[PDB]
Amino acid sequence: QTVKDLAAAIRSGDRAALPRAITLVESTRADHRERAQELLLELMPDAGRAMHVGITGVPGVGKSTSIEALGMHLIEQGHRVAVLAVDPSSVRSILGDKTRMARLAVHPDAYVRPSPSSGTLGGVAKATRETIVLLEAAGFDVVLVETVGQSEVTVADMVDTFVFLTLARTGDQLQGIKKGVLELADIVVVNKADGEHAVEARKAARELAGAMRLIYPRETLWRPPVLTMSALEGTGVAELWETVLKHRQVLIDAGEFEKRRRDQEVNWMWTMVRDAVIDRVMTSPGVREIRAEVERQVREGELTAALAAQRLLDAAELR
Amino acid sequence: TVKDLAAAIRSGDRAALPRAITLVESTRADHRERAQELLLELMPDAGRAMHVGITGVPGVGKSTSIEALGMHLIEQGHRVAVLAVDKTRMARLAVHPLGGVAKATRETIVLLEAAGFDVVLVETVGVGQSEVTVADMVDTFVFLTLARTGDQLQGIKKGVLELADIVVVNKADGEHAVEARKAARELAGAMRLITLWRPPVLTMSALEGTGVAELWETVLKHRQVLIDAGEFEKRRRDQEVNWMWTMVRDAVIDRVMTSPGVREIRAEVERQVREGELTAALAAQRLLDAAEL
């Protein structure tokens, strides 16, 4: 099949087309890499047809139950939903059932050369970002991206709205808040607000809303709302989505929605450029040979950082 | 000679530190080699001073604060430098040839330490994304803020708060005192809602002297807690390696970005990504190609 036949097969819903597209984008083989991009160029008119919503939270917070509830609610309303998991450590599919969410976790193939710059993350980010376009070409109109680590920024940069799930240990203490993640959140949810715990979840939501009113400037475009939800009982699920829709409309009204996506795309391009050159240096034979000794000398003050740096640049022969 | 200059800096000879500084500020390649020989010679002195970072938006009271701290430390017999990015007076400096200023500043800290300065305050100058660069070269990072009201702080820029080992609500004087304290408590509560060290939230009036001594006590307490957990020296040694990598990363990113071919095609390539005439992956490859590595 030509790239254009595959495009057409993905759009028309052929059993085998999406899985092959996915395997293609996952490939490290040079021809597959060339073909993957031709396919994506071909699929451009579809890029962006889905809402892109990010969902994160520490393990045990109720993320998977939340995504299931939200997914089933969106399907009842006639959406066609996929959830991509960003899984650098590969501790993570049924694509044809309109009655269920598509749940995917894409990874580059075993012949990938991991990164000193990234780790596995770079390769998974790339594959995930591209698969979003594959899903959009396939007629998915909501794409949820979830973390499974330091994957939060990577997810934030590929979505329109970033949702952070948290827990109230009590009315006065939240739980599983990693440094620097809160500031990525467009919406924060206190989940498990059910039973006797509901009242404490709400208390905790208000204190957090207060926290953010102490910090965020009063005349901003979007103050992150702080909601409560019970993924198990369905309470607040519909309202989360309403709020996600509201965030999108506020971004469109400010002339900011498309621009942001377009910005993310250019930023992503640079990150790949930056990563490739850093990797070229760091996997260099000369650097691989002398690294350990050069660090040692800086650590113990036998060498300045400046000279150590120069010596590593010299040894990289990156011309 | 480099070893003579070392000795002149250590003995406090009037002219040695300024020449040392000009040398480290040199853009010219010849002086860069000598600067590093000097620094190698001065290594046994690197680290003798406390390194304390101080930031806050313009108008928050930063200069007044540094002055009050400086005068307090001198009264106690310390010898104090403030680097912006006569033993009886505070040394106030700002070196230049962000990356270039950071480099100059980090190196000058060693020059000051070799000269017998035991406290080096590093200050953000004005508006920018310099806060990380300063955090990475100090042991304790102090963030100054203001109470707009008891219920609203002002000038808390994204991602700065998480760098703060200590947060200060300054201008807690006059009728404003009570509002400054309210604000401090609510922020402490905030951070309790959200270890080795919990960042304290203090109030202070740099203009009138109140709370200045207590800020310093707290700075000292942060250092002792780091030393007690076996983390103080390691952190400095880590910063140094990170700094080396940042210079390597910067030099290679710059080699690509300043390349003629990237200069030529950049604007057009971005345009094409923006409007979907080109994928981000191909755009990246085309920029690497244009760099002629």
Ligand SMILES: Nc1nc2c(ncn2[C@@H]2O[C@H](COP(=O)(O)OP(=O)(O)O)[C@@H](O)[C@H]2O)c(=O)[nH]1
């Ligand atoms: N009470 C209550 N329990 C929940 C809720 N959502 C999830 N849980 C439970 O908490 C545990 C972790 O949920 P899971 O969705 O696996 O969280 P994840 O690890 O963040 O995906 C499971 O036992 C869930 O059944 C909720 O809304 N209320």
Ligand SMILES: Nc1nc2c(ncn2[C@@H]2O[C@H](COP(=O)(O)OP(=O)(O)O)[C@@H](O)[C@H]2O)c(=O)[nH]1
């Ligand atoms: N009431 C009061 N006023 C202050 C205090 N510190 C500084 N100011 C005044 O507020 C202005 C702030 O300037 P400065 O202290 O240089 O802030 P910077 O730009 O961060 O250095 C000055 O014109 C001072 O006179 C303080 O602690 N209390």
Ligand SMILES: [Cl-]
């Ligand atoms: Cl828009």
